Design a protein around this ligand. Structure first.
Ligand SMILES: [Zn+2]
Ligand SMILES: [Zn+2]
Ligand SMILES: [Zn+2]
Lengths: 55, 366, 452, 263
């Protein structure tokens, strides 16, 4: 498309290999948890950012 | 003495309840047409010619020709801009052996459709003057740049037209002017319009039903093909960025568009003249530089590289998944479509919606 | 006839729970499903804010929360706010400095949270690892059974033969005020409310019928909270899957027997401990059947502009209902033909049936061919049906106490000021110095008239 | 009646670096929020419907669709298939460099045609409203601009609202889609608290966007550049034949076999 050049940049093949492995390994060892879902501190802080006078 | 006995059970035993099964294809449709990788008149100036003669009062269609015509015209106007915002429209009515330019050269469906609403009240009067109509049109198209595809669509209801001079004057001029003219006739084929359309490079078709009328109009929605005789231009185009009144309207006064009476405080400025425009795309009425939004350009790029029809088969004999690719779901219909390149599994809605609306095949993007 | 005709006050979940004690609601909110039932019934206004606030234990300021909705809609937001607070869902807590912070009831919070994610109980649901049950019951067989049971109860109100119900249920129909006790032995009779109920739609019917059961539940010693929680769990159950009666109180067993007899649940045997919930129980919620033929089952009444009704129905029950407000003309095996008329509609009106009941009753049962149009009932019919009641619902009665012919205008202005002070003023005539007061002020103002 | 269609940028490159970076927020926490958000959509209304698709490097996999084990039906079945589908996709993962971009356009295409089937399948008494929520984390792949723009207009024509949530790397295309479709584009500043943004910015109904007070839409500059030397263009010249953009005048379309008729 007619878009200007982005700031895209590749990494190293090692980073790619490790990325495929680390994420595969994380998804192999993963379970949903309420604590990992949300914390009142995160929600309230996000509410402050989203508040009518927030950032 | 046949209409009360015209049912299928008139001379059959099983037709006493299978009548709607024997005549079951009574009201359906299935729209598809061809395409081609040829130059297209993407810049398009299409002008609509509609009979204003007494013959428009006939009820050949469900309502009088006028109501059905205006009904489908509004729909056609919408999709024309929807599929080509770059293009522009204009309308001329052929009444009283005269022609009246219902709408000037513009791209604003608001004004065009508003004119249609008001045009519902027109008075079908006199005979049509094809020569007067083409005069006003060509007189206008003369000033249009050669590269812009100057085209006219004619809707003919009557069969006799009052020309003050042989239309061969105009056709010879139109041919030399490379203007293209297409005609849609009601219930009949007229040599005049057929010769006019075929010689001018357009096409003459006849309305059969409101569906056929849409089917014909549908073809006219797609940009026409172009030859090397037209100007292969490198038109200058502006891509102004929208600019709100961010600094508390400071040093940025609100202004009415060149095009409209609406005084907009924010909008698109002209990079050439700094004029104020609330909408885009808009032609600079005071510069000649057209301003178009970058997405409107891409909105037409499908015409440059459109999709191809998928391999149709009554069964997934290729034994792909029982779930249709693309949109997930069971192959509940005994008809399957397979892309020639990516060869994935597609259903009836995939073949219709992906090819006619998405214009992109998912497996080809992979 | 001192007041207007007796109306079947349709109280949705808000009206019913709005009268309950917070501890009762807190006990009710004890189950996750009860919270979801309450939550889903809330208006989208409350529905979003509750979901937005569910993950906080900080008392968000009343103003900031109220400032989440646009100026013009904030007024309509007050409705959801008044509900959430009135329903004990929202309780104010004070921020440092005494600012009005808002908090959702932790029990409700925790149960909704346990509804969305794992908790100490797995939705209070289990399979008990048992296999496919003996004498397997199919989904359509459950629906028909539930339908047949419901039809039998409606038939019992209609008083048709073979309407087999327990006397306790027949009593409840009379106890709730649906079947009037005009004659000894309780022969089939129906009040205005019962007729209104008969013309009401299945979900609102079942809902209000169960509300009357609940109104008599503690009079019958049944567990309101438990039955309600059980009912909500049933509303969130699945047709084809099996559920167990293991760990159910005798109060629940009595209700379950009623629930089974009522056809909301199917059991292998009255004593069996595993069951299948019927479509009616899953669909038992305070909702709307629709503005045309029902989504679950299409309508059959082809209402025509010439006031002619072509009901494609075999059901003697539905037919008998149509006979209440319309004059029937012909009986055909697959369809019945009738016409709505002033007299027949005046019969419904005189029996105490608001024309909107008929309009909605016909709408909910409008044959699907009548659909695909904005008005499913032609305006002429809708207007004339209403006009027939508006012809003879102009006289409105109201019991009160009249104060007239005082000695002077000072007495009138003083008595009127006293009526204004107490808000007991009903109506007044300042020209003839006439005042009408609520009957509660009869003695107070009569005695005051001797003092002024 | 509504149909939410969640799109998550299942890019192992950014998420793998994110995993290797051992940041406070990871794909695990992300899918948790998605599942809770998805549940909330169905939880918010008995009649609401939901679909989820994951945009991977080489495949657009449906995450719907629930499990039949019967511990808990509505939410647990959806979450279990989601975990299973993401595990199947992410555990049974390959390694490729030749085609490293996320198949965004294909995922959007699947969603749009899937929505089309569903909206046709729905009865016309009441109609299914729908919207797409895109959660982007990796870089914006320009090679799909053609398809991306075409699918935006399809969504526009289909009257589908598109919302987008971007983690780290922004996207001109996706922000442009939000502007065009009438959705909303938001760069989340606190990825660990992602869910709270979702439950307020993207969760409110179409019928509530108008009623709620939310962050005003970020104005999107329609930066454009020609294929010749890619410089920025505010006024350029366009081939009326192929609509190829060229910043300055020239005799022939570098993009096609066509000599301009210059005068
Ligand atoms: Zn200008
Ligand atoms: Zn393909
Ligand atoms: Zn070119």
């Amino acid at each position: 498309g007619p878009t200007p050049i982005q700031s895209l940049q590749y990494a190293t093949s090692q980073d790619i290999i490790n990325s495929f492995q680390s994420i595969r390994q994380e998804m192999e060892a993963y379970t949903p948890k309420l604590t990992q879902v949300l914390s009142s501190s995160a929600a309230s802080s996000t509410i402050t950012a989203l508040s009518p006078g927030g950032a | 003495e046949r209409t009360w006995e015209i049912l299928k059970e008139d001379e059959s035993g099983s037709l006493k309840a299978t009548i709607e099964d024997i005549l079951f294809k009574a009201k359906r449709k299935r729209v598809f047409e061809h395409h081609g990788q040829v130059r297209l008149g993407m810049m398009r100036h299409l002008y609509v010619v509609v009979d204003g003669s007494r013959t428009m009062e006939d009820q050949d269609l469900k309502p009088n020709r006028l109501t059905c015509t205006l009904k489908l015209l509004e729909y056609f106007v919408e999709e024309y801009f929807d599929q080509n915002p770059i293009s522009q429209i204009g309308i001329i009515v052929t009444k009283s052996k005269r022609a009246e330019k219902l709408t000037e050269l513009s791209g604003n469906p608001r004004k065009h459709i508003t004119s249609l609403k008001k045009a519902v009240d027109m008075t079908c009067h006199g005979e049509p003057s094809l020569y007067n109509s083409l005069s006003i049109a060509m007189q206008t198209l003369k000033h249009m740049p050669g590269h812009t595809s100057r085209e006219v669509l004619i809707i003919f209801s009557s069969l006799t037209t009052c020309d003050p001079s042989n239309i061969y004057d105009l056709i010879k001029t139109l041919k030399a002017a490379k203007i293209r003219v297409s005609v849609i006739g009601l219930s009949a084929e007229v040599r005049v319009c057929t010769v006019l359309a075929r010689e001018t490079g357009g096409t003459y078709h006849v309305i059969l039903d409101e569906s056929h009328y849409k089917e014909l109009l549908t073809h006219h929605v797609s940009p026409p093909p172009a030859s090397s005789s037209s100007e292969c231009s490198l038109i200058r185009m502006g891509f102004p960025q929208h600019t709100i009144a961010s600094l508390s309207d400071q040093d940025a006064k609100p202004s009415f568009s060149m095009a409209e009476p609406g005084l907009t405080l924010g909008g698109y400025f002209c990079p050439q003249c700094r004029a104020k425009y609330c909408e885009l795309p808009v032609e600079c009425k005071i510069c000649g530089l057209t301003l178009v939004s970058a997405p409107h350009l891409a909105r037409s790029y499908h015409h440059l590289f459109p999709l191809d029809a998928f391999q149709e088969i009554p069964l997934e004999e290729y034994n792909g998944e029982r779930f249709c690719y693309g949109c997930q779901g069971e192959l509940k219909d005994q008809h399957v479509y397979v892309c020639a390149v990516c060869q994935n599994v597609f259903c009836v809605d995939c073949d219709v919606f992906v090819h006619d609306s998405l214009h992109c095949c998912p497996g080809c993007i992979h | 006839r001192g007041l207007n005709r007796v109306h079947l006050q349709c109280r949705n979940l808000q009206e019913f729970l709005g009268g309950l004690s917070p501890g009762v609601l807190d006990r009710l909110y004890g189950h996750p499903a009860t919270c979801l039932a309450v939550f889903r019934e809330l208006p989208s206004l409350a529905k979003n804010w509750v979901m937005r606030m569910l993950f906080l234990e900080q008392p968000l300021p009343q103003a900031a929360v109220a400032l989440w909705v646009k100026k013009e809609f904030s007024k309509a937001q007050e409705e959801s706010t008044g509900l959430l607070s009135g329903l004990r869902i929202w309780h104010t807590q004070l921020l440092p400095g005494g600012l009005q912070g808002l908090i959702l009831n932790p029990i409700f919070r925790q149960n909704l949270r346990i509804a969305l994610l794992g908790g100490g109980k797995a939705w209070s649901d289990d399979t008990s690892q048992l296999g496919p049950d003996k004498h397997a019951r199919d989904v359509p067989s459950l629906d028909k059974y539930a339908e047949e049971r419901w039809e039998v109860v409606l038939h019992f109100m209609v008083g048709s033969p073979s309407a087999a119900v327990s006397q306790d249920l027949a009593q409840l129909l009379s106890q709730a005020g649906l079947m009037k006790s005009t004659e000894p032995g309780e022969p089939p009779c129906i009040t205005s409310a019962g007729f209104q109920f008969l013309l009401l739609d299945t979900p609102a019917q079942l809902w209000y019928f169960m509300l009357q059961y609940l109104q008599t539940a503690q009079s019958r010693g049944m567990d309101l909270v438990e039955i309600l929680s059980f009912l909500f769990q049933l509303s969130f159950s699945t047709l084809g899957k099996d559920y167990s009666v293991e760990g159910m109180s005798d109060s629940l067993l009595n209700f379950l027997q009623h629930l089974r007899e009522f056809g909301l649940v199917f059991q292998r045997k009255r004593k069996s401990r595993r069951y299948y919930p019927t479509r009616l129980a899953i669909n038992l919620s305070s909702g709307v059947s629709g503005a045309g033929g029902t989504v679950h089952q299409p309508g059959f009444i082809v209402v025509e502009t010439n006031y002619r009704l072509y009901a494609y129905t075999e059901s003697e029950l539905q037919i008998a209902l149509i006979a209440l407000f319309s004059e029937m003309l012909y009986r055909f095996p697959n369809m019945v033909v009738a016409q709505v008329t002033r007299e027949s509609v005046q019969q419904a009106i005189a029996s105490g049936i608001t024309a909107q009941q008929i309009i909605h009753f016909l709408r909910t049962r409008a044959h699907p061919v009548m659909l695909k149009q904005t008005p499913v009932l032609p305006p002429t019919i809708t207007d004339q049906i209403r006009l027939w009641e508006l012809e003879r619902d102009r006289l409105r009665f109201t019991e009160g106490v009249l104060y007239n012919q005082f000695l002077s205008q000072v007495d009138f202005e003083l008595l009127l000021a006293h009526a204004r002070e107490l808000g007991v003023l009903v109506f007044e005539n300042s020209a003839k110095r006439l005042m009408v007061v609520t009957p509660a002020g009869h003695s107070d103002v009569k005695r005051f008239w001797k003092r002024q | 009646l509504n149909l939410l269609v969640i799109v998550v940028d299942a890019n192992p490159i950014w998420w793998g670096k994110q995993a290797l970076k051992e940041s406070q927020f990871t794909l695990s926490k992300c899918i948790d929020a998605v599942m809770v958000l998805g549940n909330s959509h169905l939880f918010m209304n008995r009649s609401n419907k939901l679909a989820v698709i994951a945009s991977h490097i080489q495949e657009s996999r449906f995450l719907y669709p629930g499990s039949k084990d019967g511990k808990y039906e509505l939410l647990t079945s959806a979450n279990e298939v989601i975990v299973e589908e993401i595990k199947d996709l992410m555990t049974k993962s390959d390694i490729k460099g030749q085609h490293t971009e996320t198949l965004l356009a294909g995922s959007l295409a699947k969603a749009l045609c899937y929505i089309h089937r569903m909206n046709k399948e729905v009865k016309d008494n009441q109609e299914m409203k729908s919207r797409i929520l895109v959660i982007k984390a990796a870089e914006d792949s320009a090679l799909q601009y053609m398809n991306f723009m075409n699918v935006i207009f399809a969504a526009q024509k289909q009257n589908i609202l598109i919302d987008a949530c971007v983690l780290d790397s922004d996207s001109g295309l996706l922000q442009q889609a939000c502007d065009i479709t009438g959705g909303l584009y938001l760069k989340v500043p606190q990825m660990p608290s992602l869910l709270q943004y979702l439950l307020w910015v993207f969760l409110p109904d179409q019928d509530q966007r108008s009623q709620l007070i939310l962050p005003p839409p970020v104005h999107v500059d329609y930066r454009a550049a020609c294929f010749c030397h890619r410089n920025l263009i505010e006024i350029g010249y366009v081939c009326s034949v192929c609509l190829s953009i060229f910043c300055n005048f020239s005799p022939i379309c570098t993009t096609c076999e066509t000599a301009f008729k210059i005068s």
